[PDB]
Design a protein around this ligand. Structure first.
Ligand SMILES: Cc1ncc(C[n+]2csc(CCOP(=O)(O)OP(=O)(O)O)c2C)c(N)n1
Ligand SMILES: Cc1ncc(C[n+]2csc(CCOP(=O)(O)OP(=O)(O)O)c2C)c(N)n1
Ligand SMILES: [Mg+2]
Ligand SMILES: [Mg+2]
Lengths: 666, 666
């Protein structure tokens, strides 16, 4: 452990790397890194177990910077630790086009960064998911003579995260689950962007956390109380049954003679004059982006020590593999991301003779089928297990005493639920987390969902009661703009299966896409199994289910999704009687369709056929890209109503007669 | 005050109206009404001040049912109290097409219901807004010899609301603001939809609330402790500097011999057999929807008493208007919703000679100009006042000691902020609340924004840093799908002004729409003032700013919004050099354009002109409805990047050259 002048120099190396990176970019946040350098140093140099040359080592401790704006703190540490992702030149490319050092930490750009933060509150919620994953894995695979999974989850958060409701949702669950290895550092600096926190934040954070079930500790001198910080971490790991909140009081911009403790240092370059003044104040003769040789030498030990920690763990796993071969084989799946051979064969198959059912119920069949073949499937609903139909029948509930169970009960915390799943998904490539609620409530958790898409987290979102079909609950519960709001979001699949085969198909696609989240819009009401639907069609996004035309030139093309496909089919039969040739197209997913070749698209929507009709219980916006200019889109562009589903469909014109009336307009 | 058997009969009348209503619709929630009947009775019959024949009386106490699913509780009370909006027949039309008794309370459907609830957590946050409104109004208009504004805000919430992050955000704010007249009843019944709360909710709620700055009380017997409830309310009104949380332990479905204290009674009809058993158990001979004559008689006093309470206040207001004529005139504007004559003339006007500026700064000028002529304008930013540019320079900050101030500092709580504004908007029609954050974080508060649209709350959402133009913060901060995600939402205006004249126009529209929320997408970067822009044009949604064609037949039509209009204008100049006639159209708002006449539309986008180009730094989805099948839409359909804005615009092709390249494809 560093001490004396070496400790001071290392801590200041971190502060100045942050100051110089920001100054060069003339953009960024120097405040947090300056005040948090002391705890950052203790954490990466003395406490955390990791291998800088292998950021993927399974049993590594995890670090999460929830106050993402302070990313230079993390980049400085990754650089000093020896990670290949952050070299000297990368620091000099901070916030510049295409660099490994973007304005906010992004896991997909920088190996060593575990999750994507920046939107406040996500980080701490992700850490709860990471700690859940570790506890689950340890409870499920550890043996009396072999403790193979054992790592801590460290997270740094500021006042902004503490004010966000998502943070309180996640921390409430963490306390309830007894996540002893989750250790959070709260940067108590009394400053946010509007200035002093007394302006809008005067609650007793520590007492709130105690109420949530957390163990609490307060380090009053966060700027120079290095031993206090060490001691706090030690006591934190001693308390094994409760997550620990370590409040560390620091002064933002510490070291800056004229900008410390002010909102001015939160997010803008110090400036040439103040940088010079700060260098004199801290006694930093060294120049731009300099790492003193003795500091560099001290930090270099992490490479050989890191290699040895992993070698030690590998030996342990080899011995585990020979005693518990089966458990080892299963754990390897979660560690490598390689799904078991033939998992696809476990998916249900249906025929139009199978009894009709709501896609939400068919979803449950697929979930229980998959639970047997995919060891990493884990998840649950936000207090709606009996409506969402998300219980894995063969398992109990994940709880502090039964962490090995696979049904996770989130309570009424949608947003926290989403971020926790992002944490699970990014813990190990073999996890396949799924979470659920009513489709309309994705609005509550849209922040975490957008992060899923941007961070390439393969979370499967099971959303039921997807339309006015839910009936009586009314407009506050009926989605309308939701499908298009997600078709417009990049890198996320918006699947809306019509029946059993499409539902199984949606799940095949969802499991196969480990780098892109999937949303399944499922119905509350029973739907018939349609002839023409198939697992293979779904992978295509938009495909033909029935066609009585020839030469790829039907008189009419009718397209639909989910519960409205049936209506499109019934209308097509009707129109065929009158002698017209009609093609019925299922658009389970716009995303997958757009990804197909031009040949494929032409084969489904021939450019020559202009008479096109679409039907879907939701906004009509955007359908023009498929129905064309002379085409007609039947939908709902107003809020719903409180009444029996049947009545709403009739009153809103989501009927076979509307398709027919529209057909005779061509 | 009722007592003995009369009190028991009154309380049971409430239980049975709820039971019968749910049984007849065979849909609904009987549990909460059955368990909460006692406190509802005490609240509406003994505590609240209101005039059942005038649901709009300004100084009435406000009640909010945050646990919206239990609406039958409120319908039963409104019925008994004498409100004209809930007759016996309305109770029999519960959850049926077009009834005044929808499945969740909607203020727009039922006079007497203050806000729209159903999505959990919104109600308690709305109550915080209602209480803020009363506190602000009292501090601002009360005189030492005249206390004209004085009312309490009562709210009932359940475990579901207590778990939602939005509730913690608003209650954190309520404690910080010392809202002594906010009195919340927490229905502590240990049941949620997944069953017993021990499955996912074991935090110490009361201690969390004390940490937030709330006064706490616990009534252990909420089923029959009528005097304990009364006493608790008495103590709550005595504590004047802190909001009070009264935890009332009850048993859900109280009275039902076989379904009480179980999840089965939460949200489904009891069923014929259990209804009979419940009638026997409580000793309720009376049949379907019956109100005993003695109960009816007891409740009828509220009509003459209510009339007298309001008459009293009216006299008091008349004497107030005589002494303080000026203050009275200003207060009346907030009360009646009638805005001062000529407020429109206060808006700034600009010309292309005016210096260029970011629309976020131009927004501030408009807000400050408006503060002077619109008494009900109040609001602020979620810890981003210095970036959103929302401070009303002539005022201080709203705080427990300075409640008369008009700048509200919400801290980093977007969702709570939105719900609180809905509460203010719905307190009185003259309030014009505005709130702000970066456009990308609308995702955090989308739940409340949707409710603004559905409940017809004229909230003005000031959203800055609307695109990749914000630069270096990166993809986590850059909107992409947001504009279309709101153009798809019913009853909400999605305004994206290009310059000063358009920004002033956007505010004119926003202020005039008191029944529909408005969102303003504002830029971070400086934009020039363009020739052709005007306040009037904005009211049209889509209008021409420059045209060199004749006979309404240009060779090319180029449309754009906000920061991209400038690019479209520059490209048109180039093309006009080559001898083409080009029409430049501004689409400040899709919504406003679609509401215009067919003649008007044809005059801007002549059906005969097929060469159309649109440019907007956002998703291209939906632009097809204006650019046509042969038109081209230039936009961004992927996430952003961390880099200087200029570089991102070039790399993504949001440039004049892209417009020109596309123009030569026609
Ligand atoms: C959900 C969300 N809302 C708003 C912001 C904008 N924002 C970034 S940092 C910040 C200030 C938070 O201050 P704090 O976390 O206490 O950190 P410090 O100033 O101490 O570094 C705000 C409002 C954001 N990144 N995410
Ligand atoms: C934001 C949101 N998420 C989920 C739901 C679905 N929902 C309606 S009631 C409910 C149960 C909450 O139970 P509680 O508030 O404790 O009331 P009780 O069952 O005791 O009446 C849930 C999860 C919702 N209405 N809103
Ligand atoms: Mg801070
Ligand atoms: Mg409950």
């Amino acid at each position: 452990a560093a001490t004396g002048e070496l400790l001071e120099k290392s801590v200041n190396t971190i502060r100045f790397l942050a100051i110089d990176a920001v100054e060069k970019a003339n953009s960024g946040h120097p405040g947090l890194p300056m005040g948090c350098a002391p705890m950052g140093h203790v954490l990466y140099d003395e406490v955390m177990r990791y291998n800088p040359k292998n950021p993927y080592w399974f049993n590594r401790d995890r670090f999460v910077l929830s106050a993402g704006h302070g990313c230079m703190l993390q980049y400085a540490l990754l650089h000093l630790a020896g990670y290949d992702s952050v070299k000297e030149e990368d620091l000099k490319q901070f916030r510049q086009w295409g660099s490994r050092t973007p304005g906010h930490p992004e896991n997909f750009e920088t190996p060593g960064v575990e999750v994507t933060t920046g939107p406040l509150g996500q980080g701490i919620a992700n850490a709860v998911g990471l700690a859940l994953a570790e506890k689950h894995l340890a409870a499920r695979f550890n043996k009396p003579d072999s403790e193979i999974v054992d790592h801590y989850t460290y997270v740094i958060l500021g006042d902004g995260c503490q004010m966000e409701g998502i943070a309180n949702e996640a921390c409430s669950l963490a306390g309830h689950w007894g996540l002893g290895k989750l250790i959070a550092f709260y940067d108590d600096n009394h400053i946010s962007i509007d200035g002093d926190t007394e302006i809008a934040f005067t609650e007793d954070v520590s007492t709130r956390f105690e109420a949530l079930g957390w163990h609490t500790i307060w380090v009053k001198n966060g700027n120079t109380g290095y031993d206090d910080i060490r001691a706090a971490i030690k006591e934190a790991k001693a308390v094994t049954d409760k997550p620990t909140l370590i409040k560390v009081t620091t002064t933002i911009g510490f070291g800056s003679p004229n900008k410390a403790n002010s909102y001015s240092v939160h997010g803008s370059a110090l400036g040439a004059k103040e940088v010079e003044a700060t260098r004199q104040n801290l006694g930093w003769p060294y120049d731009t982006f300099f790492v003193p040789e003795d500091v560099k030498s001290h930090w270099s030990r992490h490479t050989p020590e890191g290699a040895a920690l992993e070698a030690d763990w590998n030996a342990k796993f080899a011995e585990y593999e020979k005693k518990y071969a089966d458990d080892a084989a299963t754990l390897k799946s979660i560690i490598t991301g390689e799904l078991p051979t033939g998992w696809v064969d476990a998916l249900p198959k249906y025929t139009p003779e199978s009894p009709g059912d709501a896609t939400r119920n068919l979803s449950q069949q697929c979930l229980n089928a998959l639970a047997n073949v995919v060891p990493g499937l884990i998840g649950g609903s936000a207090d709606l297990a009996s409506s969402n139909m998300t219980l894995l029948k063969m398992f109990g509930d994940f709880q502090k005493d039964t962490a090995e169970e696979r049904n996770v009960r989130f309570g009424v915390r949608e947003h926290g639920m989403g971020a926790i799943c992002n944490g699970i998904a990014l813990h190990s490539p073999g996890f396949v987390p799924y979470c659920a609620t009513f489709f309309v409530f994705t609005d509550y958790m849209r922040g975490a969902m957008r992060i899923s898409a941007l961070s390439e987290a393969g979370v499967i979102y099971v959303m039921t009661h997807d339309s006015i079909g839910l009936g009586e609950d009314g407009p506050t519960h009926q989605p309308i703009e939701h499908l298009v709001s997600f078709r417009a979001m990049p890198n996320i699949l918006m699947l809306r299966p019509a029946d059993g085969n499409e539902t199984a198909g949606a799940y095949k696609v969802a499991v196969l896409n480990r780098k892109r989240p999937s949303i399944l819009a499922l119905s509350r009401q029973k739907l018939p199994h349609l002839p023409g639907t198939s697992i293979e069609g779904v992978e295509k996004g938009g495909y033909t289910i029935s066609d009585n035309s020839t030469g790829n030139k039907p008189d009419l093309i009718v397209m639909g999704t989910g519960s409205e496909l049936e209506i499109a089919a019934k209308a097509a039969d009707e129109l065929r009687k009158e002698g017209k040739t009609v093609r019925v197209v299922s658009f389970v997913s716009w995303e997958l369709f757009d990804e197909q070749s031009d040949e494929y698209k032409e084969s489904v929507l021939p450019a020559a056929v202009t008479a096109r009709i679409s039907i879907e219980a939701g906004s009509t916006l955007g359908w023009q890209k498929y129905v064309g200019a002379q085409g007609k889109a039947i939908g709902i562009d107003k809020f719903g109503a409180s009444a029996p589903a049947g009545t709403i469909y009739k009153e809103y014109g989501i009927t076979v007669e509307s398709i027919i009336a529209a057909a005779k307009s061509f």
